[PDB]
Amino acid sequence: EIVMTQSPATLSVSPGERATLSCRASQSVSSNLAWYQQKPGQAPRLLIYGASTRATGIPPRFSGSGSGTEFSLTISSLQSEDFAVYYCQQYNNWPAITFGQGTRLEIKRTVAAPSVFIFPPSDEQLKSGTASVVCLLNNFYPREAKVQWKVDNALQSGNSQESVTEQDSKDSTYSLSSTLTLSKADYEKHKVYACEVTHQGLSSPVTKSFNRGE
């Protein structure tokens, strides 16, 4: 098999600028190379074939170049909806089609601070014997963020899980949820539940909190 390598696997390119993505082949594949764009939750869409020919309906700011073993995909005037994983694929050795493992292109927009919300567990879930406390960080950039749980001003470790949305196709921001999971018995031992958020567009950390009964 011909091994296709896309390195680096991630790139962060500012909007309006030019992003160059790399794809390299273990042997010559001539011009039998294609590029696909896969947005989150969607099937791949064909961008380039023949290593330089644009598929139908693909705007000309997408450009493919190269031959043999070295190839590039150039996206000019980078836009927020260009966030995706881009795959190169050789079809020289048909039908032994092989893909590169893809490069994820992040849109490097300006810093945006998160809006922070805290949600107490519902009483419906409380009957079932478990309490889920959800802290939300909404529409921030960059992705890096620290979320800390304080239960009666005591640090919580090992009892929370985080989930992050894909970069938004419109405003290029991220959103994140932290979920604290405790037993109803352990939920009812303590009083103060606080979510402390540290991030780059916040000068000092933001805390949102509630008290169990009130």
């Binding site: 294609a34 893809g102 809006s115 519902s122 959800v134 939300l136 949305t165």
Partner: protein, 227 residues
């Protein structure tokens, strides 16, 4: 308008069998050869199988050789993948993909239309429907700012669940988080939306949760709680 519609994916025991279907509309089916391409969770694309436009010629990747069978019924615009002796490494989203240029080998190796894909999960774990709980907005400050509300979809297997708001009316500002695999081995996710703080009590907010693997459809209405 070309449309490829995969169907038949689901939860199946290791060693079991499953047959996938791809409904085809919007072009001359006989003119084009067809492919199956799969994608494991969080992984890349892997070509699996190819069938010629006539149907005489079939090809398979080594990883599925002797276990998968591609077939077509050009009469009724259908493409099939028969999957036998399934393993955990076969768990993936399976895409139906149409070749670009009609002809044969000289013009093949490129896919210009793809289906939305169907998920195949190879596991011995049991199907389990989720519980839906509200993420009630509270202490909505300034009455002209923005408040956050949502739904917590907890303890289900297998993937996926879908969440909409107000039957797909409320679309702007909705963030449906990727599912998280909990310590129990069940999945859980949250869907949240940010809305005008003054609409609380004026507009009702309902999250429509669908977990098709367990035949679970739930509408949960989210309101501010007392005190």
């Amino acid at each position: 308008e070309v449309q490829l519609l995969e169907s038949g994916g689901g939860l199946v025991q290791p060693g079991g069998s499953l047959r996938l279907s791809c409904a085809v509309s919007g072009f001359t089916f006989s003119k084009y050869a067809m492919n199956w391409v799969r994608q494991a969770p969080g992984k890349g694309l892997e070509w699996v199988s190819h069938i010629s436009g006539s149907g005489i010629s079939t090809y398979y990747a080594d990883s599925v050789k002797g276990r998968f069978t591609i077939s077509r019924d050009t009469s009724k615009n259908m493409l099939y993948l028969q999957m036998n002796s399934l393993r955990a490494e076969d768990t993936a989203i399976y895409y139906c993909a149409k070749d670009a240029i009609s002809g044969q080998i000289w013009l093949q190796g490129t896919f210009d239309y793809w289906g939305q894909g169907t998920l195949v999960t190879v596991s011995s774990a049991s199907t389990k429907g989720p519980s839906v709980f509200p993420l009630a907005p509270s202490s909505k400050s300034t009455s002209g700012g923005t408040a956050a509300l949502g739904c917590l979809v907890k303890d289900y297997f297998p993937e996926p669940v879908t969440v909409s708001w107000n039957s797909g009316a409320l679309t702007s500002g909705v963030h449906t988080f990727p599912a998280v695999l909990q310590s129990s081995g069940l999945y859980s996710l949250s869907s949240v939306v940010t809305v005008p703080s003054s609409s609380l009590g004026t507009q009702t907010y309902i999250c429509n949760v669908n977990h098709k693997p367990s035949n679970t459809k739930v509408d949960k209405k989210v309101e501010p709680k007392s005190c």
